[PDB]
mmCIF file of all heavy atoms in Angstrom:
data_model
loop_
_atom_site.group_PDB
_atom_site.id
_atom_site.type_symbol
_atom_site.label_atom_id
_atom_site.label_comp_id
_atom_site.label_asym_id
_atom_site.label_seq_id
_atom_site.Cartn_x
_atom_site.Cartn_y
_atom_site.Cartn_z
ATOM 1 N N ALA A 165 -20.211 -21.042 -16.128
ATOM 2 C CA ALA A 165 -19.295 -20.090 -16.675
ATOM 3 C C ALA A 165 -18.387 -19.528 -15.544
ATOM 4 O O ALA A 165 -17.166 -19.278 -15.760
ATOM 5 C CB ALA A 165 -19.958 -19.028 -17.431
ATOM 6 N N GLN A 166 -19.058 -19.177 -14.411
ATOM 7 C CA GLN A 166 -18.305 -18.525 -13.326
ATOM 8 C C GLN A 166 -17.250 -19.469 -12.696
ATOM 9 O O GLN A 166 -16.160 -19.088 -12.353
ATOM 10 C CB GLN A 166 -19.374 -18.101 -12.235
ATOM 11 C CG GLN A 166 -18.770 -17.911 -10.857
ATOM 12 C CD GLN A 166 -19.783 -17.949 -9.795
ATOM 13 O OE1 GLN A 166 -20.781 -18.664 -9.874
ATOM 14 N NE2 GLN A 166 -19.533 -17.268 -8.684
ATOM 15 N N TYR A 167 -17.626 -20.772 -12.558
ATOM 16 C CA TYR A 167 -16.625 -21.727 -12.039
ATOM 17 C C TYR A 167 -15.795 -22.391 -13.134
ATOM 18 O O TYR A 167 -14.892 -23.175 -12.810
ATOM 19 C CB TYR A 167 -17.321 -22.851 -11.252
ATOM 20 C CG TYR A 167 -17.620 -22.487 -9.854
ATOM 21 C CD1 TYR A 167 -18.633 -21.644 -9.533
ATOM 22 C CD2 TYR A 167 -16.898 -23.081 -8.830
ATOM 23 C CE1 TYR A 167 -18.924 -21.317 -8.185
ATOM 24 C CE2 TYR A 167 -17.136 -22.781 -7.486
ATOM 25 C CZ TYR A 167 -18.245 -21.867 -7.219
ATOM 26 O OH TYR A 167 -18.528 -21.594 -5.879
ATOM 27 N N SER A 168 -16.020 -22.080 -14.420
ATOM 28 C CA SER A 168 -15.253 -22.653 -15.506
ATOM 29 C C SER A 168 -13.895 -22.002 -15.750
ATOM 30 O O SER A 168 -13.497 -21.125 -14.978
ATOM 31 C CB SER A 168 -16.022 -22.647 -16.817
ATOM 32 O OG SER A 168 -17.182 -23.498 -16.698
ATOM 33 N N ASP A 169 -13.200 -22.464 -16.783
ATOM 34 C CA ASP A 169 -11.872 -21.900 -17.137
ATOM 35 C C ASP A 169 -11.985 -21.207 -18.511
ATOM 36 O O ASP A 169 -12.685 -21.618 -19.353
ATOM 37 C CB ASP A 169 -10.848 -22.979 -17.121
ATOM 38 C CG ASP A 169 -10.220 -23.170 -15.796
ATOM 39 O OD1 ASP A 169 -10.347 -22.243 -14.929
ATOM 40 O OD2 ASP A 169 -9.650 -24.228 -15.510
ATOM 41 N N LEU A 170 -11.128 -20.204 -18.667
ATOM 42 C CA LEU A 170 -11.062 -19.422 -19.935
ATOM 43 C C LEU A 170 -9.926 -19.955 -20.755
ATOM 44 O O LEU A 170 -8.726 -19.875 -20.347
ATOM 45 C CB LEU A 170 -10.886 -17.942 -19.590
ATOM 46 C CG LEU A 170 -12.164 -17.207 -19.271
ATOM 47 C CD1 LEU A 170 -11.883 -15.914 -18.530
ATOM 48 C CD2 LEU A 170 -12.940 -16.889 -20.618
ATOM 49 N N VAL A 171 -10.250 -20.452 -21.948
ATOM 50 C CA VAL A 171 -9.229 -21.064 -22.846
ATOM 51 C C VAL A 171 -9.492 -20.520 -24.252
ATOM 52 O O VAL A 171 -10.573 -20.085 -24.623
ATOM 53 C CB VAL A 171 -9.351 -22.604 -22.894
ATOM 54 C CG1 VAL A 171 -8.801 -23.149 -21.605
ATOM 55 C CG2 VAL A 171 -10.854 -23.020 -23.038
ATOM 56 N N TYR A 172 -8.360 -20.432 -24.987
ATOM 57 C CA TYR A 172 -8.327 -20.021 -26.380
ATOM 58 C C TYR A 172 -7.580 -21.079 -27.196
ATOM 59 O O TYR A 172 -6.585 -21.582 -26.663
ATOM 60 C CB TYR A 172 -7.767 -18.653 -26.587
ATOM 61 C CG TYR A 172 -8.319 -17.855 -27.761
ATOM 62 C CD1 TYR A 172 -9.356 -17.008 -27.598
ATOM 63 C CD2 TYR A 172 -7.734 -18.013 -29.030
ATOM 64 C CE1 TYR A 172 -9.845 -16.275 -28.680
ATOM 65 C CE2 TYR A 172 -8.208 -17.319 -30.078
ATOM 66 C CZ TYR A 172 -9.264 -16.404 -29.905
ATOM 67 O OH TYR A 172 -9.823 -15.703 -30.942
ATOM 68 N N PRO A 173 -8.050 -21.428 -28.404
ATOM 69 C CA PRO A 173 -7.337 -22.454 -29.157
ATOM 70 C C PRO A 173 -5.951 -22.119 -29.539
ATOM 71 O O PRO A 173 -5.656 -20.957 -29.841
ATOM 72 C CB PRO A 173 -8.231 -22.659 -30.377
ATOM 73 C CG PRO A 173 -9.581 -22.172 -29.981
ATOM 74 C CD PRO A 173 -9.333 -21.104 -28.971
ATOM 75 N N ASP A 174 -5.079 -23.132 -29.568
ATOM 76 C CA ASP A 174 -3.678 -22.886 -29.892
ATOM 77 C C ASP A 174 -3.521 -22.703 -31.393
ATOM 78 O O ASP A 174 -4.427 -22.884 -32.198
ATOM 79 C CB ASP A 174 -2.806 -24.082 -29.448
ATOM 80 C CG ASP A 174 -1.410 -23.659 -29.047
ATOM 81 O OD1 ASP A 174 -1.098 -22.515 -29.185
ATOM 82 O OD2 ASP A 174 -0.648 -24.505 -28.530
ATOM 83 N N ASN A 175 -2.273 -22.296 -31.799
ATOM 84 C CA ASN A 175 -1.984 -22.039 -33.182
ATOM 85 C C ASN A 175 -1.944 -23.297 -33.994
ATOM 86 O O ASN A 175 -2.367 -23.308 -35.192
ATOM 87 C CB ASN A 175 -0.618 -21.294 -33.316
ATOM 88 C CG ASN A 175 0.494 -22.125 -32.861
ATOM 89 O OD1 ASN A 175 0.505 -23.393 -32.946
ATOM 90 N ND2 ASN A 175 1.526 -21.467 -32.285
ATOM 91 N N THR A 176 -1.575 -24.415 -33.397
ATOM 92 C CA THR A 176 -1.485 -25.729 -34.070
ATOM 93 C C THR A 176 -2.823 -26.498 -34.046
ATOM 94 O O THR A 176 -2.823 -27.660 -34.222
ATOM 95 C CB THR A 176 -0.413 -26.587 -33.421
ATOM 96 O OG1 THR A 176 -0.697 -26.779 -32.069
ATOM 97 C CG2 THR A 176 0.946 -25.827 -33.398
ATOM 98 N N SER A 177 -3.919 -25.787 -33.853
ATOM 99 C CA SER A 177 -5.216 -26.433 -33.727
ATOM 100 C C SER A 177 -5.696 -26.858 -35.068
ATOM 101 O O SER A 177 -5.219 -26.403 -36.147
ATOM 102 C CB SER A 177 -6.222 -25.468 -33.016
ATOM 103 O OG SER A 177 -7.561 -26.033 -33.113
ATOM 104 N N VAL A 178 -6.730 -27.757 -35.114
ATOM 105 C CA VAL A 178 -7.350 -28.158 -36.311
ATOM 106 C C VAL A 178 -8.097 -27.005 -36.995
ATOM 107 O O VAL A 178 -8.120 -26.930 -38.237
ATOM 108 C CB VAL A 178 -8.247 -29.386 -36.034
ATOM 109 C CG1 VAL A 178 -8.818 -30.021 -37.298
ATOM 110 C CG2 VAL A 178 -7.533 -30.430 -35.264
ATOM 111 N N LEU A 179 -8.674 -26.186 -36.175
ATOM 112 C CA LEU A 179 -9.540 -25.110 -36.755
ATOM 113 C C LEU A 179 -8.780 -23.980 -37.484
ATOM 114 O O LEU A 179 -9.342 -23.197 -38.163
ATOM 115 C CB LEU A 179 -10.387 -24.433 -35.595
ATOM 116 C CG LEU A 179 -11.615 -25.227 -35.112
ATOM 117 C CD1 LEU A 179 -11.193 -26.255 -34.059
ATOM 118 C CD2 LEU A 179 -12.648 -24.301 -34.702
ATOM 119 N N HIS A 180 -7.420 -23.964 -37.268
ATOM 120 C CA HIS A 180 -6.628 -23.038 -38.104
ATOM 121 C C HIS A 180 -6.353 -23.573 -39.463
ATOM 122 O O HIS A 180 -5.738 -22.922 -40.310
ATOM 123 C CB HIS A 180 -5.335 -22.699 -37.315
ATOM 124 C CG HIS A 180 -5.527 -21.844 -36.125
ATOM 125 N ND1 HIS A 180 -4.469 -21.310 -35.428
ATOM 126 C CD2 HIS A 180 -6.677 -21.521 -35.539
ATOM 127 C CE1 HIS A 180 -4.949 -20.649 -34.398
ATOM 128 N NE2 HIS A 180 -6.283 -20.747 -34.381
ATOM 129 N N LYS A 181 -6.774 -24.812 -39.718
ATOM 130 C CA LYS A 181 -6.612 -25.459 -41.082
ATOM 131 C C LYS A 181 -8.029 -25.774 -41.601
ATOM 132 O O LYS A 181 -8.188 -26.687 -42.338
ATOM 133 C CB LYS A 181 -5.822 -26.723 -41.015
ATOM 134 C CG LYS A 181 -4.374 -26.524 -40.535
ATOM 135 C CD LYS A 181 -3.656 -27.828 -40.428
ATOM 136 C CE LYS A 181 -4.068 -28.625 -39.233
ATOM 137 N NZ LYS A 181 -3.722 -27.953 -37.985
ATOM 138 N N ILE A 182 -8.993 -24.905 -41.277
ATOM 139 C CA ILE A 182 -10.348 -25.156 -41.729
ATOM 140 C C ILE A 182 -10.542 -24.947 -43.222
ATOM 141 O O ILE A 182 -11.326 -25.596 -43.907
ATOM 142 C CB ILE A 182 -11.311 -24.301 -40.907
ATOM 143 C CG1 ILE A 182 -12.778 -24.606 -41.253
ATOM 144 C CG2 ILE A 182 -11.046 -22.813 -41.031
ATOM 145 C CD1 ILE A 182 -13.239 -26.020 -40.987
ATOM 146 N N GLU A 183 -9.719 -23.994 -43.810
ATOM 147 C CA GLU A 183 -9.850 -23.701 -45.234
ATOM 148 C C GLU A 183 -9.410 -24.930 -46.082
ATOM 149 O O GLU A 183 -9.911 -25.118 -47.143
ATOM 150 C CB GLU A 183 -9.050 -22.445 -45.557
ATOM 151 C CG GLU A 183 -7.541 -22.568 -45.486
ATOM 152 C CD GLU A 183 -7.006 -22.288 -44.054
ATOM 153 O OE1 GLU A 183 -7.801 -22.355 -43.112
ATOM 154 O OE2 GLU A 183 -5.769 -22.063 -43.969
ATOM 155 N N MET A 184 -8.416 -25.700 -45.577
ATOM 156 C CA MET A 184 -8.090 -26.968 -46.262
ATOM 157 C C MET A 184 -9.219 -27.953 -46.233
ATOM 158 O O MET A 184 -9.473 -28.616 -47.232
ATOM 159 C CB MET A 184 -6.824 -27.568 -45.611
ATOM 160 C CG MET A 184 -5.576 -26.774 -45.758
ATOM 161 S SD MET A 184 -4.101 -27.595 -45.078
ATOM 162 C CE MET A 184 -4.373 -27.223 -43.365
ATOM 163 N N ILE A 185 -9.956 -28.010 -45.148
ATOM 164 C CA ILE A 185 -11.118 -28.859 -45.037
ATOM 165 C C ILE A 185 -12.208 -28.471 -46.024
ATOM 166 O O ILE A 185 -12.795 -29.322 -46.705
ATOM 167 C CB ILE A 185 -11.658 -28.890 -43.597
ATOM 168 C CG1 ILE A 185 -10.518 -29.095 -42.558
ATOM 169 C CG2 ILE A 185 -12.749 -29.936 -43.415
ATOM 170 C CD1 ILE A 185 -9.844 -30.407 -42.724
ATOM 171 N N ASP A 186 -12.481 -27.156 -46.120
ATOM 172 C CA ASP A 186 -13.472 -26.710 -47.090
ATOM 173 C C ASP A 186 -13.018 -26.840 -48.514
ATOM 174 O O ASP A 186 -13.820 -27.004 -49.442
ATOM 175 C CB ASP A 186 -13.872 -25.305 -46.699
ATOM 176 C CG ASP A 186 -14.158 -25.128 -45.264
ATOM 177 O OD1 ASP A 186 -14.894 -25.919 -44.696
ATOM 178 O OD2 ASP A 186 -13.662 -24.108 -44.688
ATOM 179 N N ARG A 187 -11.727 -26.724 -48.743
ATOM 180 C CA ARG A 187 -11.174 -26.912 -50.113
ATOM 181 C C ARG A 187 -11.193 -28.385 -50.584
ATOM 182 O O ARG A 187 -11.668 -28.634 -51.736
ATOM 183 C CB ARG A 187 -9.778 -26.380 -50.173
ATOM 184 C CG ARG A 187 -9.169 -26.453 -51.572
ATOM 185 C CD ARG A 187 -7.696 -25.982 -51.645
ATOM 186 N NE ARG A 187 -7.538 -24.590 -51.318
ATOM 187 C CZ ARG A 187 -7.725 -23.549 -52.144
ATOM 188 N NH1 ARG A 187 -8.106 -23.753 -53.399
ATOM 189 N NH2 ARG A 187 -7.566 -22.304 -51.753
ATOM 190 N N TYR A 188 -10.895 -29.333 -49.664
ATOM 191 C CA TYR A 188 -10.683 -30.689 -50.102
ATOM 192 C C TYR A 188 -11.867 -31.591 -49.750
ATOM 193 O O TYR A 188 -12.333 -32.370 -50.619
ATOM 194 C CB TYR A 188 -9.413 -31.271 -49.475
ATOM 195 C CG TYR A 188 -8.145 -30.655 -50.162
ATOM 196 C CD1 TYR A 188 -7.657 -29.490 -49.667
ATOM 197 C CD2 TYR A 188 -7.618 -31.183 -51.231
ATOM 198 C CE1 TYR A 188 -6.540 -28.919 -50.246
ATOM 199 C CE2 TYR A 188 -6.472 -30.691 -51.863
ATOM 200 C CZ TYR A 188 -5.960 -29.485 -51.311
ATOM 201 O OH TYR A 188 -4.843 -28.927 -51.922
ATOM 202 N N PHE A 189 -12.340 -31.499 -48.548
ATOM 203 C CA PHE A 189 -13.437 -32.385 -48.151
ATOM 204 C C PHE A 189 -14.850 -31.826 -48.540
ATOM 205 O O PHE A 189 -15.819 -32.437 -48.189
ATOM 206 C CB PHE A 189 -13.417 -32.551 -46.605
ATOM 207 C CG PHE A 189 -12.416 -33.533 -46.180
ATOM 208 C CD1 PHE A 189 -11.044 -33.172 -46.009
ATOM 209 C CD2 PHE A 189 -12.727 -34.842 -45.897
ATOM 210 C CE1 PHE A 189 -10.119 -34.040 -45.613
ATOM 211 C CE2 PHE A 189 -11.777 -35.752 -45.483
ATOM 212 C CZ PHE A 189 -10.499 -35.360 -45.389
ATOM 213 N N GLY A 190 -14.867 -30.706 -49.274
ATOM 214 C CA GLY A 190 -16.112 -30.236 -49.821
ATOM 215 C C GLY A 190 -16.405 -30.826 -51.232
ATOM 216 O O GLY A 190 -17.467 -30.322 -51.804
ATOM 217 N N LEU A 191 -15.645 -31.753 -51.767
ATOM 218 C CA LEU A 191 -15.904 -32.282 -53.095
ATOM 219 C C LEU A 191 -17.072 -33.231 -53.035
ATOM 220 O O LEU A 191 -17.531 -33.650 -51.960
ATOM 221 C CB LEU A 191 -14.634 -32.976 -53.546
ATOM 222 C CG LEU A 191 -13.478 -32.028 -53.895
ATOM 223 C CD1 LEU A 191 -12.488 -32.747 -54.846
ATOM 224 C CD2 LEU A 191 -13.938 -30.725 -54.517
ATOM 225 N N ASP A 192 -17.583 -33.602 -54.251
ATOM 226 C CA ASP A 192 -18.856 -34.267 -54.346
ATOM 227 C C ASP A 192 -18.782 -35.714 -53.857
ATOM 228 O O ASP A 192 -19.719 -36.221 -53.286
ATOM 229 C CB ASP A 192 -19.309 -34.190 -55.791
ATOM 230 C CG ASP A 192 -19.891 -32.780 -56.104
ATOM 231 O OD1 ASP A 192 -20.357 -32.080 -55.196
ATOM 232 O OD2 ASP A 192 -19.831 -32.398 -57.290
ATOM 233 N N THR A 193 -17.714 -36.428 -54.243
ATOM 234 C CA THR A 193 -17.534 -37.838 -53.914
ATOM 235 C C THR A 193 -16.249 -38.089 -53.191
ATOM 236 O O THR A 193 -15.354 -37.229 -53.167
ATOM 237 C CB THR A 193 -17.582 -38.731 -55.162
ATOM 238 O OG1 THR A 193 -16.470 -38.420 -56.037
ATOM 239 C CG2 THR A 193 -18.873 -38.553 -55.920
ATOM 240 N N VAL A 194 -16.113 -39.293 -52.588
ATOM 241 C CA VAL A 194 -14.966 -39.621 -51.749
ATOM 242 C C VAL A 194 -13.713 -39.737 -52.646
ATOM 243 O O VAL A 194 -12.622 -39.280 -52.207
ATOM 244 C CB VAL A 194 -15.208 -40.923 -51.004
ATOM 245 C CG1 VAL A 194 -14.076 -41.312 -50.085
ATOM 246 C CG2 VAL A 194 -16.544 -40.895 -50.242
ATOM 247 N N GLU A 195 -13.808 -40.291 -53.790
ATOM 248 C CA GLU A 195 -12.719 -40.478 -54.676
ATOM 249 C C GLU A 195 -12.134 -39.183 -55.174
ATOM 250 O O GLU A 195 -10.949 -39.038 -55.420
ATOM 251 C CB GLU A 195 -13.015 -41.465 -55.805
ATOM 252 C CG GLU A 195 -13.405 -42.820 -55.400
ATOM 253 C CD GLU A 195 -13.903 -43.702 -56.541
ATOM 254 O OE1 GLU A 195 -14.023 -43.162 -57.656
ATOM 255 O OE2 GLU A 195 -14.089 -44.923 -56.268
ATOM 256 N N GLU A 196 -13.064 -38.234 -55.370
ATOM 257 C CA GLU A 196 -12.598 -36.890 -55.731
ATOM 258 C C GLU A 196 -11.700 -36.249 -54.674
ATOM 259 O O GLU A 196 -10.702 -35.674 -54.952
ATOM 260 C CB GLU A 196 -13.786 -35.985 -56.031
ATOM 261 C CG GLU A 196 -14.459 -36.255 -57.368
ATOM 262 C CD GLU A 196 -15.774 -35.528 -57.556
ATOM 263 O OE1 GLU A 196 -15.913 -34.445 -56.922
ATOM 264 O OE2 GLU A 196 -16.681 -36.061 -58.219
ATOM 265 N N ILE A 197 -12.128 -36.433 -53.376
ATOM 266 C CA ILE A 197 -11.342 -35.890 -52.253
ATOM 267 C C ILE A 197 -9.977 -36.613 -52.216
ATOM 268 O O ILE A 197 -8.989 -35.940 -52.033
ATOM 269 C CB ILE A 197 -12.131 -36.107 -50.918
ATOM 270 C CG1 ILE A 197 -13.540 -35.577 -51.035
ATOM 271 C CG2 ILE A 197 -11.361 -35.414 -49.778
ATOM 272 C CD1 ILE A 197 -14.405 -35.965 -49.823
ATOM 273 N N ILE A 198 -9.961 -37.933 -52.303
ATOM 274 C CA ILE A 198 -8.730 -38.699 -52.254
ATOM 275 C C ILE A 198 -7.787 -38.274 -53.414
ATOM 276 O O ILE A 198 -6.581 -38.143 -53.202
ATOM 277 C CB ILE A 198 -9.041 -40.190 -52.293
ATOM 278 C CG1 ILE A 198 -9.739 -40.549 -50.952
ATOM 279 C CG2 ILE A 198 -7.765 -40.981 -52.417
ATOM 280 C CD1 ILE A 198 -10.457 -41.901 -50.996
ATOM 281 N N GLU A 199 -8.364 -38.139 -54.615
ATOM 282 C CA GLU A 199 -7.533 -37.791 -55.797
ATOM 283 C C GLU A 199 -6.978 -36.362 -55.648
ATOM 284 O O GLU A 199 -5.849 -36.119 -55.995
ATOM 285 C CB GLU A 199 -8.385 -37.959 -57.072
ATOM 286 C CG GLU A 199 -7.665 -37.733 -58.352
ATOM 287 C CD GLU A 199 -6.953 -38.947 -58.872
ATOM 288 O OE1 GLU A 199 -6.589 -39.884 -58.089
ATOM 289 O OE2 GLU A 199 -6.705 -39.048 -60.067
ATOM 290 N N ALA A 200 -7.791 -35.414 -55.181
ATOM 291 C CA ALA A 200 -7.266 -34.051 -55.028
ATOM 292 C C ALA A 200 -6.141 -34.018 -53.918
ATOM 293 O O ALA A 200 -5.176 -33.294 -54.117
ATOM 294 C CB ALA A 200 -8.439 -33.151 -54.662
ATOM 295 N N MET A 201 -6.372 -34.690 -52.848
ATOM 296 C CA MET A 201 -5.397 -34.696 -51.806
ATOM 297 C C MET A 201 -4.088 -35.399 -52.234
ATOM 298 O O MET A 201 -2.973 -34.999 -51.913
ATOM 299 C CB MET A 201 -5.954 -35.406 -50.532
ATOM 300 C CG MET A 201 -7.025 -34.616 -49.832
ATOM 301 S SD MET A 201 -6.310 -33.348 -48.786
ATOM 302 C CE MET A 201 -5.627 -34.411 -47.547
ATOM 303 N N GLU A 202 -4.214 -36.451 -53.073
ATOM 304 C CA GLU A 202 -3.112 -37.124 -53.676
ATOM 305 C C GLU A 202 -2.350 -36.252 -54.604
ATOM 306 O O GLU A 202 -1.132 -36.252 -54.657
ATOM 307 C CB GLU A 202 -3.537 -38.416 -54.358
ATOM 308 C CG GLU A 202 -3.722 -39.628 -53.465
ATOM 309 C CD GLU A 202 -2.501 -40.521 -53.385
ATOM 310 O OE1 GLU A 202 -1.456 -40.110 -53.850
ATOM 311 O OE2 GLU A 202 -2.635 -41.607 -52.807
ATOM 312 N N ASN A 203 -3.087 -35.414 -55.399
ATOM 313 C CA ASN A 203 -2.449 -34.503 -56.343
ATOM 314 C C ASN A 203 -1.723 -33.449 -55.621
ATOM 315 O O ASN A 203 -0.599 -33.072 -56.029
ATOM 316 C CB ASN A 203 -3.509 -33.907 -57.228
ATOM 317 C CG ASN A 203 -4.062 -34.878 -58.260
ATOM 318 O OD1 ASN A 203 -3.367 -35.772 -58.704
ATOM 319 N ND2 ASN A 203 -5.313 -34.753 -58.565
ATOM 320 N N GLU A 204 -2.277 -32.918 -54.489
ATOM 321 C CA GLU A 204 -1.493 -31.939 -53.678
ATOM 322 C C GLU A 204 -0.313 -32.569 -53.028
ATOM 323 O O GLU A 204 0.738 -31.919 -52.847
ATOM 324 C CB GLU A 204 -2.422 -31.251 -52.727
ATOM 325 C CG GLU A 204 -1.825 -30.061 -51.980
ATOM 326 C CD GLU A 204 -1.867 -28.755 -52.825
ATOM 327 O OE1 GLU A 204 -2.202 -28.790 -53.991
ATOM 328 O OE2 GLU A 204 -1.572 -27.718 -52.203
ATOM 329 N N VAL A 205 -0.418 -33.841 -52.584
ATOM 330 C CA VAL A 205 0.710 -34.488 -52.005
ATOM 331 C C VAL A 205 1.838 -34.740 -53.007
ATOM 332 O O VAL A 205 2.982 -34.779 -52.620
ATOM 333 C CB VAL A 205 0.306 -35.837 -51.351
ATOM 334 C CG1 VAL A 205 1.527 -36.604 -50.810
ATOM 335 C CG2 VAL A 205 -0.652 -35.633 -50.255
ATOM 336 N N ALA A 206 1.446 -34.960 -54.288
ATOM 337 C CA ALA A 206 2.463 -35.022 -55.304
ATOM 338 C C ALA A 206 3.074 -33.704 -55.645
ATOM 339 O O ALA A 206 4.260 -33.587 -55.921
ATOM 340 C CB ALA A 206 1.842 -35.670 -56.603
ATOM 341 N N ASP A 207 2.236 -32.676 -55.622
ATOM 342 C CA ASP A 207 2.719 -31.314 -56.014
ATOM 343 C C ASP A 207 3.382 -30.614 -54.790
ATOM 344 O O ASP A 207 4.528 -30.232 -54.859
ATOM 345 C CB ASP A 207 1.604 -30.510 -56.592
ATOM 346 C CG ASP A 207 1.192 -31.011 -58.002
ATOM 347 O OD1 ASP A 207 1.928 -31.736 -58.615
ATOM 348 O OD2 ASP A 207 0.132 -30.620 -58.505
ATOM 349 N N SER A 208 2.547 -30.362 -53.787
ATOM 350 C CA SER A 208 2.949 -29.536 -52.650
ATOM 351 C C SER A 208 3.709 -30.255 -51.544
ATOM 352 O O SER A 208 4.441 -29.619 -50.741
ATOM 353 C CB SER A 208 1.796 -28.770 -52.055
ATOM 354 O OG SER A 208 2.132 -28.029 -50.951
ATOM 355 N N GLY A 209 3.563 -31.596 -51.517
ATOM 356 C CA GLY A 209 4.151 -32.479 -50.381
ATOM 357 C C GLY A 209 3.747 -31.955 -49.049
ATOM 358 O O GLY A 209 4.552 -31.886 -48.111
ATOM 359 N N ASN A 210 2.457 -31.711 -48.886
ATOM 360 C CA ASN A 210 1.908 -31.273 -47.601
ATOM 361 C C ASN A 210 1.881 -32.450 -46.564
ATOM 362 O O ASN A 210 1.262 -33.475 -46.835
ATOM 363 C CB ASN A 210 0.501 -30.683 -47.775
ATOM 364 C CG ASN A 210 0.101 -29.838 -46.620
ATOM 365 O OD1 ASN A 210 0.903 -29.456 -45.737
ATOM 366 N ND2 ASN A 210 -1.185 -29.457 -46.578
ATOM 367 N N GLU A 211 2.517 -32.207 -45.437
ATOM 368 C CA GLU A 211 2.610 -33.225 -44.395
ATOM 369 C C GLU A 211 1.260 -33.515 -43.786
ATOM 370 O O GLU A 211 0.955 -34.663 -43.431
ATOM 371 C CB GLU A 211 3.648 -32.783 -43.308
ATOM 372 C CG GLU A 211 5.022 -32.750 -43.750
ATOM 373 C CD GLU A 211 5.398 -31.414 -44.352
ATOM 374 O OE1 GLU A 211 4.555 -30.527 -44.391
ATOM 375 O OE2 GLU A 211 6.510 -31.252 -44.860
#
């Protein structure tokens, strides 16, 4: 720690989109995740 560097994650990090991961990748099966993400891509057009 004494010889290491102090860093903080950037705004564009993956961990600032963790709620999307828990919303979509928390579903029971793979096809449910794919279908939900496809539905949001049709509705919200999330990049």
Side-chain angles (χ1 to χ4, degrees):
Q166 160 202 29
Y167 276 73
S168 295
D169 273 342
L170 276 158
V171 286
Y172 210 93
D174 211 356
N175 64 34
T176 60
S177 172
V178 188
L179 283 86
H180 291 187
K181 301 178 285 295
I182 185 62
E183 69 274 16
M184 293 183 284
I185 311 296
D186 313 311
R187 185 182 295 276
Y188 289 88
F189 282 81
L191 293 199
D192 284 332
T193 63
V194 183
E195 299 176 351
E196 284 170 30
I197 310 170
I198 293 162
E199 186 84 337
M201 290 279 291
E202 279 265 11
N203 289 327
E204 189 82 350
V205 175
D207 289 345
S208 179
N210 197 12
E211 293 85 4

